[PDB]
């Protein structure tokens, strides 16, 4: 079972859950849920949204 990473949030996507979006330019994205899907489609930058793993890496939260 190939577990994918969410293209917006970064959470692991199990085979049962998630959604796949193949853009016309020729690249594929995986979305954990409709929240992340809508956030990505609204062109929101994941590094400015607090709960995103990219935001946590950027702000050095935890560890």
């Amino acid at each position: 079972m190939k577990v994918e990473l969410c293209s917006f949030s970064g959470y692991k996507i199990y085979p049962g859950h998630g959604r796949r979006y193949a853009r016309t330019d020729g690249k594929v994205f995986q979305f954990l849920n409709a929240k992340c899907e809508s956030a990505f489609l609204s062109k929101r930058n994941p590094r400015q949204i607090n709960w995103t793993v990219l935001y946590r890496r950027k702000h050095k939260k935890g560890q």
Binding site: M1, Y14, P15, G16, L32
Partner: protein, 394 residues
């Protein structure tokens, strides 16, 4: 005149007494025909629907486009604690039908089974089977019981066993156990009666009655939906918006010359709570309940040879609107009739199951355990803790 454009009718004419089922527990309308060559075995069991989840496995059907590829299937969990045998009953075939001949109950009967005989348990004095148990503690009673068993052996053609579920081991609120007659199929009538008598006042697990990779039937009451219109009950075409006296209604009921409404006309009424018998449900996994040797053993429920984790079939926070499954369970392919907490009857298949898809062996690779109380994203609380790290509530 005739109908211009032909179209198939709405609904099934063979399924339309559209009334709330008089019974709540599924009735086995037909048991498998007993062949007097196989050993004795119970042909049915009584479980309770808990919830549904995912399953991931590799299929082994040659020639298919998805052969030797990972697939996901929806699986329904039915918690099936072992049932206590409390009585036996004989049936004699008559030209009028199948008449019950003699019913013999056990000496000791649990309060869970006793609750069924009383509509009100708090008000009653719990006097059921008070003088009947005296037959098992007297010489005259023992002789009478032996004579009854001999008469059943001589005359009865069909022998069924009265077994009741163990409501104590369930998270359900109710304590009134469900009793059920299960027809025993096996050898001669004498050997069958001897086996049934030996199994008296004994537990019966699901491994005895059913095995892995078996096609069975699920009998139960549909989740009720109350009074419904024709558009929902029979899925008829909706009238256009311009209609004056409603649009979610059947427009033409019948013709003029027959001055009566036919039974085949789709009418508004009760929808749901219908007795149903789904067939060809595949047992993906018969999982063992919680057992203790030194500590709790919860891995046996959801851990597989490819996952080797410490997860149980219970998702995070338990099953929604059911509880936590701690007893033996059966995992069936696809959905089954009835809502949560609903009692279901599992019956052995009535047909010779010789098919490419019905003989396929199932080897699971991954069992989903994400919380169903929303969009769950973590399989286990340990993984969630590892991913999140420390929180403020620490």
């Amino acid at each position: 005149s005739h109908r211009k454009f032909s179209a198939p009718r709405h609904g099934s004419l063979g399924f339309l007494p559209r009334k709330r089922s008089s019974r709540h527990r599924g009735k086995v309308k037909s048991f498998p025909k007993d062949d007097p060559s196989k050993p004795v075995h119970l042909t049915a069991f009584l479980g309770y629907k808990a919830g549904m989840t995912h399953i991931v496995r590799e299929v082994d059907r040659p020639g298919s486009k998805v052969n030797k590829k990972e697939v996901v299937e929806a699986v329904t969990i039915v918690e099936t604690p072992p049932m206590v045998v409390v009585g036996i009953v004989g049936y004699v075939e008559t030209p009028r039908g199948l008449r019950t001949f003699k019913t013999v109950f056990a000496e000791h009967i649990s309060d869970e089974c006793k609750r069924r005989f009383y509509k009100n348990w708090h008000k009653s004095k719990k006097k059921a089977f008070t003088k009947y148990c005296k037959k098992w503690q007297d010489d005259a009673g023992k002789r009478q019981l032996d004579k009854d068993f001999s008469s059943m052996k001589k005359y009865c053609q069909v022998i069924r066993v009265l077994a009741h579920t163990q409501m104590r081991l369930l998270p359900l609120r109710q304590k009134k156990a469900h009793l059920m007659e299960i027809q025993v199929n096996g050898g001669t009538v004498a050997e069958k009666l001897d086996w049934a008598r030996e199994r008296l006042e004994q537990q019966v697990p699901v491994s005895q009655v059913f095995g892995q990779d078996e096609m069975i039937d699920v009998i139960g009451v549909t989740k009720g939906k109350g009074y419904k219109g024709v558009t929902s009950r029979w899925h008829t075409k909706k009238l256009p918006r311009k209609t004056h006296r409603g649009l979610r209604k059947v427009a033409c009921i019948g013709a003029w010359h027959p001055a009566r409404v036919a039974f085949s006309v789709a009418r508004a009424g009760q929808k749901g709570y219908h007795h149903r018998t789904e067939i060809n449900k595949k047992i993906y996994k018969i999982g063992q309940g919680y057992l203790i040797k030194d500590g709790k053993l919860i891995k046996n429920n959801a851990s597989t040879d490819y996952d080797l984790s410490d997860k149980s079939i219970n998702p995070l926070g338990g099953f929604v609107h059911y509880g936590e499954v701690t007893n033996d369970f059966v995992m069936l392919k696809g959905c089954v009739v009835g809502t949560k907490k609903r009692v279901l009857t599992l019956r052995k298949s009535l047909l010779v199951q010789t098919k490419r898809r019905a003989l396929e062996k199932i080897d699971l690779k991954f069992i989903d355990t994400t919380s169903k109380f929303g969009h769950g994203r973590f399989q286990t609380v340990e993984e969630k803790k590892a991913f999140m790290g420390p929180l403020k509530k620490d």
